[PDB]
Design an enzyme around this catalytic site. Structure first.
Site, mmCIF file in Angstrom:
data_model
loop_
_atom_site.group_PDB
_atom_site.id
_atom_site.type_symbol
_atom_site.label_atom_id
_atom_site.label_comp_id
_atom_site.label_asym_id
_atom_site.label_seq_id
_atom_site.Cartn_x
_atom_site.Cartn_y
_atom_site.Cartn_z
ATOM 1 N N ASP A 1 36.035 32.540 36.209
ATOM 2 C CA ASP A 1 36.407 33.334 37.282
ATOM 3 C C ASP A 1 37.929 32.968 37.698
ATOM 4 O OD1 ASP A 1 37.001 35.344 39.336
ATOM 5 O OD2 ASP A 1 35.385 34.463 40.662
ATOM 6 N N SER B 1 53.025 43.961 36.620
ATOM 7 C CA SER B 1 52.834 44.841 35.488
ATOM 8 C C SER B 1 54.147 45.915 35.502
ATOM 9 C CB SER B 1 51.883 45.849 35.356
ATOM 10 O OG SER B 1 51.985 46.560 34.116
#
Length: 330
Positions: free
Chosen positions: A35, A199
């Site tokens: 994770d 992004s």
């Protein structure tokens, strides 16, 4: 040194991925969920409330000659679905794919919430975010990666998750045979303890690319892709009959649909998520309504590039003095 371990979907929908981890002496092998959005390595154990264990493999520290109680240490953590776990702490030897760390904090669960009990395939979590998020008190502990880093050939790990198939976590090296083209690296902020990056935009299907900054985290421990409501609405508007359902808890779509791809930007590069990766199947057994793999982050407070996005790429988690993230097509 290096390590290399196969990671395997827990079910036919890729709801999560498990990776075998050796703990203790002699080794006890548990299947952990790696994770990159948390920083605790915790396991089902011989200390876990018996009624809260249902088919998981447990770590028994009393059977490990290298286990030592970390006196006074406790931990307690919550996850995005509201699940949680807590307990005490041992140090022990932990190996992943041939890479060994001695003195790793292994957090032993005394209590786990119902969703953990109900998932027999996940024996615990191995956190790979920054150690500043580790929950051990009163002395915060380091992640497996942080402890291994100095020994690694290169201070990196890579995630190569499969679509409905096994994939690989590598530590200490970049497998140049595992991706196509080049790796595009992008800046990371560690201010919130995550692999947080921005992004450069998105496209839906064969549509034009929209240049827009989307701050979010690279999170192997989250199944889906969570993005701003504007972006998600634009995606689902291209699927006939798709709608946001408050009763189900997100966007659903007709199981008869063919889903469009979704592209996200990494600098000037582009990662394409095929439409099939966005199908999470019937909302309940036998239903013709299917759950979407792209959902709104509104009210989460952060955008999350979870497995839906990451499995479309070869992803480099670069833990050099100034961390960065790399993405390649594959």
């Amino acid at each position: 040194s290096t390590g290399s371990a196969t990671t395997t979907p827990i079910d036919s929908l890729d709801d999560a991925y498990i990776t075998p981890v050796q703990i203790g002496t002699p080794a006890q092998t548990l299947n952990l969920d790696f994770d990159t959005g948390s920083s605790d390595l915790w396991v089902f154990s011989s200390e876990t409330t018996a009624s809260e264990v249902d088919g998981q493999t447990i770590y028994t520290p009393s059977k490990s000659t290298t286990a030592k109680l970390l006196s006074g240490a406790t931990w307690s953590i919550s996850y995005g679905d509201g699940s949680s776990s807590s307990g005490d702490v041992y140090t022990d030897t932990v190996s992943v794919g041939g890479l060994t760390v001695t003195g790793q904090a292994v957090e032993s669960a005394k209590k786990v919430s119902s969703s953990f009990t109900e998932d027999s395939t996940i024996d615990g979590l191995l956190g790979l975010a920054f150690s500043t998020l580790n929950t051990v008190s009163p002395t915060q502990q380091k992640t497996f990666f942080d402890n291994a880093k100095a020994s690694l050939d290169s201070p990196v790990f890579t995630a190569d998750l499969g679509y409905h198939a096994p994939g690989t976590y590598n530590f200490g090296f970049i497998d140049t045979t595992a991706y196509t083209g080049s790796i595009t690296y992008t800046a990371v902020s560690t201010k919130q303890g995550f692999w947080e990056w921005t992004s450069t935009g998105y496209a839906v299907g064969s549509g034009t690319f929209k240049s827009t900054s989307i701050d979010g985290i690279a999170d192997t421990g989250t199944t889906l892709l969570y993005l701003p409501a504007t972006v998600v609405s634009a995606y689902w508007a291209q699927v006939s009959g798709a709608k946001s359902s408050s009763s189900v808890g997100g966007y659903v779509f007709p199981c008869s649909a063919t889903l469009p791809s979704f592209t996200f930007g990494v600098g000037s590069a582009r990662i394409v998520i095929p439409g099939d990766y966005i199908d999470f199947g019937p909302i309940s057994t036998g239903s013709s309504s299917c759950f979407g793999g792209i959902q709104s982050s509104a009210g989460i407070g952060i955008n999350i590039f979870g497995d839906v996005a990451l499995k479309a790429a070869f992803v480099v988690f670069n833990g050099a003095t100034t961390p960065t993230l790399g993405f390649a097509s594959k």
